[PDB]
Amino acid sequence: AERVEQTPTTTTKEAGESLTINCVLRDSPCSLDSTFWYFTKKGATKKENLSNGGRYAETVNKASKSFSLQISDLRVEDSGTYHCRAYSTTGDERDCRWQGYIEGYGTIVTVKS
Amino acid sequence: NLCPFGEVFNATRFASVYAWNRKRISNCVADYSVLYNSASFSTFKCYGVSPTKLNDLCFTNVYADSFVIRGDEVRQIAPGQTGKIADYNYKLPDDFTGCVIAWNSNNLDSKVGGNYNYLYRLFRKSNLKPFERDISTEIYQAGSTPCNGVEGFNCYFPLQSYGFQPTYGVGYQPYRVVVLSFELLHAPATVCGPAA
Numbered sequence: 294a295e296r297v298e299q300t301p302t303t304t305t306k307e308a309g310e311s312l313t314i315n316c317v318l319r320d321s322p323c324s325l326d327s328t329f330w331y332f333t334k335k336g337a338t339k340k341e342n343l344s345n346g347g348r349y350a351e352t353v354n355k356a357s358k359s360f361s362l363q364i365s366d367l368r369v370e371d372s373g374t375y376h377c378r379a380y381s382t383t384g385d386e387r388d389c390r391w392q393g394y395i396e397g398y399g400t401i402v403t404v405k406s
Numbered sequence: 407n408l409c410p411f412g413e414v415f416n417a418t419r420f421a422s423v424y425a426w427n428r429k430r431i432s433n434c435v436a437d438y439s440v441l442y443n444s445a446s447f448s449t450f451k452c453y454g455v456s457p458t459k460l461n462d463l464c465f466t467n468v469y470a471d472s473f474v475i476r477g478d479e480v481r482q483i484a485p486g487q488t489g490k491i492a493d494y495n496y497k498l499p500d501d502f503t504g505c506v507i508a509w510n511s512n513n514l515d516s517k518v519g520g521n522y523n524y525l526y527r528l529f530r531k532s533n534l535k536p537f538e539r540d541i542s543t544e545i546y547q548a549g550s551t552p553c554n555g556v557e558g559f560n561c562y563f564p565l566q567s568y569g570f571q572p573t574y575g576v577g578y579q580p581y582r583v584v585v586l587s588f589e590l591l592h593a594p595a596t597v598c599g600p601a602a
């Protein structure tokens with residue numbers, strides 16, 4: 294039940310294309326107070342922070358508890374696992390008992406050619 | 407001189423959830439903020455305290471509990487939850503004060519043949535009490551007919567292996583979990599964040 298649903302689980306693209314990843318906090322009494330994205334390079338285990346800037350656009354709709362990442366002009370070196378993180382930090386909606394964060398299961402991205 | 411959280415978070419092998427491990431932490435300083443800010447965790451959920459306040463607080467005792475479950479069970483490590491993990495394996499009390507921390511450990515804990523070393527309890531006659539531990543392996547009598555310590559019709563070995571394989575869906579992959587309980591008892595408070 295209470296989870297961050299991340300779509301798609303996997304995509305293949307050609308380089309020069311772009312890709313959107315969508316996360317929603319489902320079955321939660323908690324508000325979406327803040328969001329963060331990370332990238333694991335194919336073959337690495339270190340999670341790299343991704344900022345809003347350059348080829349990365351990060352959006353949030355707090356009311357529907359959704360957030361997205363759009364990557365513009367995909368490269369082969371963009372191939373890897375993308376994670377989204379949802380923060381609930383006010384913990385003052387009546388039935389919301391936690392402060393902290395939960396992530397989706399990730400998106401495995403394959404960029405070709 | 408700093409708390410040995412390293413011994414818990416980075417242990418080579420974790421416990422099965424039914425045989426969950428506990429380290430009693432005392433007489434030390436702990437930078438909770440470097441844990442909370444680390445990119446390595448996928449769950450960091452604090453009940454009855456804010457994660458960004460922990461560096462500022464002191465406690466009598468911190469318990470660091472640790473085990474492996476599958477990713478889609480991580481939500482059952484919370485006060486007031488139901489399901490086979492919360493009911494039969496590891497139960498938190500309603501008034502829990504602590505953080506639940508989890509990360510994907512597919513790279514450490516899954517094996518090509520299946521890792522048979524991580525189990526969970528699938529059957530029990532009653533729900534665990536908060537922080538109770540059951541490591542018994544008696545055949546579970548599901549029906550009216552007596553088992554006499556023999557697996558059989560409605561007579562089940564009570565532990566199931568996760569059998570983690572690296573090719574499983576991420577909901578079926580192994581997650582390492584650490585639960586930090588912050589205990590405040592009549593004693594004076596030896597376990598501090600740096601800023602306290």
Ligand SMILES: *[C@@H]1O[C@H](CO[C@@H]2O[C@@H](C)[C@@H](O)[C@@H](O)[C@@H]2O)[C@@H](O[C@@H]2O[C@H](CO)[C@@H](O)[C@H](O)[C@H]2NC(C)=O)[C@H](O)[C@H]1NC(C)=O
Pocket residue numbers: 411412413415416441
């Ligand atoms: C648990 O381990 C990580 C990783 O540590 C390094 O790699 C290990 C395989 C081993 O070689 C360790 O001795 C290494 O330190 C710890 O993260 C490191 O923390 C230190 C601070 O002491 C820091 O300088 C490094 O930047 C961190 N390294 C990485 C790769 O992040 C982590 O702190 C340990 N967790 C706990 C709670 O103790």
